[PDB]
Design a protein around this ligand. Structure first.
Ligand SMILES: CCC(=O)c1cc(-c2cc(OC)c(Cn3ccnc3)c(OC)c2)c2ccccn12
Ligand SMILES: CCC(=O)c1cc(-c2cc(OC)c(Cn3ccnc3)c(OC)c2)c2ccccn12
Lengths: 104, 105
């Protein structure tokens, strides 16, 4: 129940609110996205990021952002620009970096 | 705030709870589903069904079911069986038939 665990849970909820349909909520499977596990080797989702917040695995804000950036980068690498998953990733990426940089 | 509006809102919430990702929450567009407007001429969603519940446009349970059936049928007509949207429609269909069968008491 640390001061960082407070801060990252606050950050996560605010980002999860930008994903109302829950595309970033758990891992993408090959059933719904063919070839995903071959193309993306470092998968990331909000679900996984929450499990790391409970298990206290984030030592800094930057470690949280790193995963956040990875999730969005995976989306913008696997999906074409015309897709909803891509566009959502790009918005959410930009919004997330403004939401948790140079603040107090 | 009628006795039918109570009943249909209860029905709607129970079905909407089976669609956590909200694929049935507003109209499908051709941007996300190519050729949808050519294949499906009578689109229906939970959003539209909620607007009709507020504006009291459902005179009976059967009028509600009719739309419910249309939404699910559109899904099972446009999408292939192996897709997420199909399987979700088929579950939601079956759940509605049990929820609103001839035994409503
Ligand atoms: C953002 C991750 C992404 O690229 C993504 C997410 C989804 C995605 C994720 C989902 O749950 C996390 C779901 C919801 N889902 C998954 C299994 N059953 C429902 C989904 O439904 C169409 C699409 C998806 C689908 C095809 C191609 C890419 N994606
Ligand atoms: C169930 C209706 C259906 O068949 C359906 C719904 C969706 C669908 C609907 C959505 O919003 C109501 C959404 C959510 N969305 C779309 C644009 N911004 C969010 C979605 O996620 C990709 C898929 C879809 C997509 C491709 C092919 C069929 N469908």
């Amino acid at each position: 129940s640390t001061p960082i665990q407070q801060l990252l849970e606050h950050f996560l909820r605010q980002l999860q609110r930008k994903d109302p349909h829950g595309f970033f909520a758990f891992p993408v499977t090959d059933a719904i996205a063919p070839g995903y596990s071959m193309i993306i080797k470092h998968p990331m989702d909000f679900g996984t990021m929450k499990d790391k917040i409970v298990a206290n695995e984030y030592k800094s804000v930057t470690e949280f952002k790193a995963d956040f950036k990875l999730m969005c980068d995976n989306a913008m690498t696997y999906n074409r620009p015309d897709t909803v998953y891509y566009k959502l990733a790009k918005k959410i990426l930009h919004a997330g970096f403004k939401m948790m940089s140079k603040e107090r």
